[PDB]
Amino acid sequence: KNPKSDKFKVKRFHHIEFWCGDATNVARRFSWGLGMRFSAKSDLSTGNMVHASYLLTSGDLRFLFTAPYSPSLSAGEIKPTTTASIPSFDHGSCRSFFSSHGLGVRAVAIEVEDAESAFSISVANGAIPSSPPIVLNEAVTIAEVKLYGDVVLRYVSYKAEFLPGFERVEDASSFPLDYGIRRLDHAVGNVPELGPALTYVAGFTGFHQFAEFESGLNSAVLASNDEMVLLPINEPVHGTKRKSQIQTYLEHNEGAGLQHLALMSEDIFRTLREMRKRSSIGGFDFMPSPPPTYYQNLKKRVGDVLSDDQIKECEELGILVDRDDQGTLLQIFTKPLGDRPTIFIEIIQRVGCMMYQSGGCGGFGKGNFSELFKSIEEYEKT
Amino acid sequence: KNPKSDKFKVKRFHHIEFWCGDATNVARRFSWGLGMRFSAKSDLSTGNMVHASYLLTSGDLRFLFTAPYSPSLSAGEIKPTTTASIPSFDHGSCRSFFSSHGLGVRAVAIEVEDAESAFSISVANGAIPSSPPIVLNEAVTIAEVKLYGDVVLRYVSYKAEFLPGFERVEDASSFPLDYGIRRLDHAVGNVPELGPALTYVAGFTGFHQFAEFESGLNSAVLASNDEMVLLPINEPVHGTKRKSQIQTYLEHNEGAGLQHLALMSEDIFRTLREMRKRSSIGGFDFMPSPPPTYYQNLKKRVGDVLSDDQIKECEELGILVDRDDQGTLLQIFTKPLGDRPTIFIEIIQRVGCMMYQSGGCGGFGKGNFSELFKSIEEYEKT
Ligand SMILES: Cn1c(=O)n(-c2ccccc2)c(=O)c2cc(C(=O)C3=C(O)CCCC3=O)ccc21
Ligand SMILES: Cn1c(=O)n(-c2ccccc2)c(=O)c2cc(C(=O)C3=C(O)CCCC3=O)ccc21
Ligand SMILES: [Co+2]
Ligand SMILES: [Co+2]
């Protein structure tokens, strides 16, 4: 069931913004680890005396990395005279965010038809305002409302080059890395209480619940009209044998925040080969692979979707496979991206649901909790 | 002239500690960019609820990267019951340092015979105490005094495995990168006033002035008895045609601090080839190369030390060459390591002064200021 109840016209995920202590080092690490190209900058060299912001791109995926300069560089400025290219930025907010949460996502940005209208309608429907609509160079409008914790939902709308005041990165400094990642599939929040979080976000967006089919969590997925903007949310389940990963997140993050970003690959086997080659030379690490019993049991579940060779390719890369009633999901999870056991990345590829591919084809892999446990127990038996 | 006036027995540079917002991302970037191996850790996985610390090594060079966790993880602790492996660490100090200065060196650590004695003698001779001597697992003693700005001089002494409480990094997560860097040659501070800075540091160490032969700076070099611990200091020269790079540093750093680390390579040509291959894929960028007039003029100055081919290798890597009356210096400078125009790295290799090689052989390249300007002007002519 999809009532298509969006209260304003939503297009696609636009970008994800990380708030960092040093944007340069995080961006260079992410670029190498994920195969993303440096494509735009806003920093001292572009006249921005407030913040350093570096944009990485892979296909349609946009990762922005921002850190504050010394406030003394911009002490003479006022908001009317700011040199910040993202006028919602605040030194105190950014330092407080990073000192409280460590490295993490500050903004989940979606493109809309009219960011001023989206902001107005959202706030009229219960959204907590974060930054009012601001028109940049009469070309782009940005506005922000609170999503959960200190994460904001950022609306961006264009009249007709990432943002004004950003400069394209010289091709010498712009190496064309590409490991196959193409777009953001979903962005997942961890909260202490799922019910109130869903009521709040569904309240001001009109996003609807995307239906699913002792893991430590309850979850639900909010979706836009065409189900291309997907915002799952988790809460912990307490009193379990193994401590809930959601609760550990909430403790180390100092509360609610963004838990994982799922990045769609046009060839998850190539992406994982390339990322795994770089794990120990500056890139990202992956969770430990499931036991071979998991891939032995892969035949009876998806033996009609993947050949035995393609199943062999999954086992040597540690890829997980799940299936709903409409499609098949290939997925794998990185270890946490930074010092704290908080944010991580998921790499995914979806098989099926062609009409273009419909959003969420194959689900989100919730079945892989049970299959993992079953495999683990029956691998010990063997 | 070397009066050998050290007030306590100093051995060698031991390590450099960076205070970071996220130690993981900075360390992974530096590892790939410089060819340093992950060799030790102290973090949540080792029981440290206070800070994450990751050690990179290349030869005898030791880079430590540290960032604070949420203070809430260790709220029950007191200094007697701390789980921090570096007991001088302070959450508030670290967040204040990083919010004030951005990514940079907090500690220049030297090995001494007796860190408690070095601390006592230093403070008795005017050193401002930072962290008193603390004996770790009855095996290592660390103490800290102020050096300049918020940078500390850290004394470490061993009775007879980096520090207690650190664990060796599993060889799977430990890729044996090596681009030829072997040790720290010198560590350079920027201050507003050179005179008082030298008087202070020479006052409590007994280090002596290491003699040199409109660049925007005045400088001097303090040295230990065998001139293997080398601590240059710069001050700006104001009212110049081009703004002093020292003054720009002081402005963007919010005051005095560590300006550059010079890393000795056992083969600067291999090091630069390897680092330059990685500049645009996560590594470090280098300052723009001198014009070919510079390398044309290289024959008449060092044509007796380097062949024409080895001079050719210098021009294609952008390496600078200088000479004193005892040896020859090969050097090159990176662009700043992080967001701010503050800290950078120098790669060096020294030729001559064999007896082992004596410290500072060839000087520090101060002659390369004039040679660069001369080359620049006479390249425009050609
Ligand atoms: C098997 N499995 C898993 O093991 N971990 C895991 C990772 C690192 C450390 C420990 C556990 C996951 O996080 C994980 C996450 C998902 C997931 O993406 C997801 C959604 O997107 C939204 C609906 C709720 C949901 O479940 C699926 C399977 C997962
Ligand atoms: C030619 N040259 C240079 O161009 N820069 C530069 C770098 C980036 C941006 C602009 C200028 C330098 O920093 C630089 C530094 C040194 C140096 O190391 C040094 C010492 O170690 C101690 C004594 C004082 C001193 O000079 C030598 C030559 C240098
Ligand atoms: Co997911
Ligand atoms: Co130097």
Curated annotation (Swiss-Prot), chains A, B:
Gene Ontology terms describing biological process: L-phenylalanine catabolic process; tyrosine catabolic process
Catalysed reaction equations from the record: 3-(4-hydroxyphenyl)pyruvate + O2 = homogentisate + CO2
EC number, UniProt record: 1.13.11.27
Cited function: Catalyzes the conversion of 4-hydroxyphenylpyruvic acid to homogentisic acid, one of the steps in tyrosine catabolism.
Cofactor: Fe cation
Protein name: 4-hydroxyphenylpyruvate dioxygenase
CDD domains in UniProt: HPPD_C_like, HPPD_N_like
Subunit-level organization: Homodimer.
Protein encoded by which gene: HPD
GO CC aspect terms: cytoplasm
Pathway involvement of the protein, from the record: Amino-acid degradation; L-phenylalanine degradation; acetoacetate and fumarate from L-phenylalanine: step 3/6; Cofactor biosynthesis; prenylquinone biosynthesis
List of residues binding Fe cation: H186, H260, E346
Protein origin, superkingdom: Eukaryota
Limits of the VOC domain: 12-158, 183-335
Family (UniProt): Belongs to the 4HPPD family.
Gene3D superfamilies in alphabetical order: 2,3-Dihydroxybiphenyl 1,2-Dioxygenase, domain 1
Keywords of the record: Cytoplasm, Dioxygenase, Iron, Metal-binding, Oxidoreductase, Phenylalanine catabolism, Repeat, Tyrosine catabolism
GO molecular function, one term: iron ion binding
Cofactor binding notes: Binds 1 Fe cation per subunit.
Location in or out of the cell: Cytoplasm
Originating species: Arabidopsis thaliana
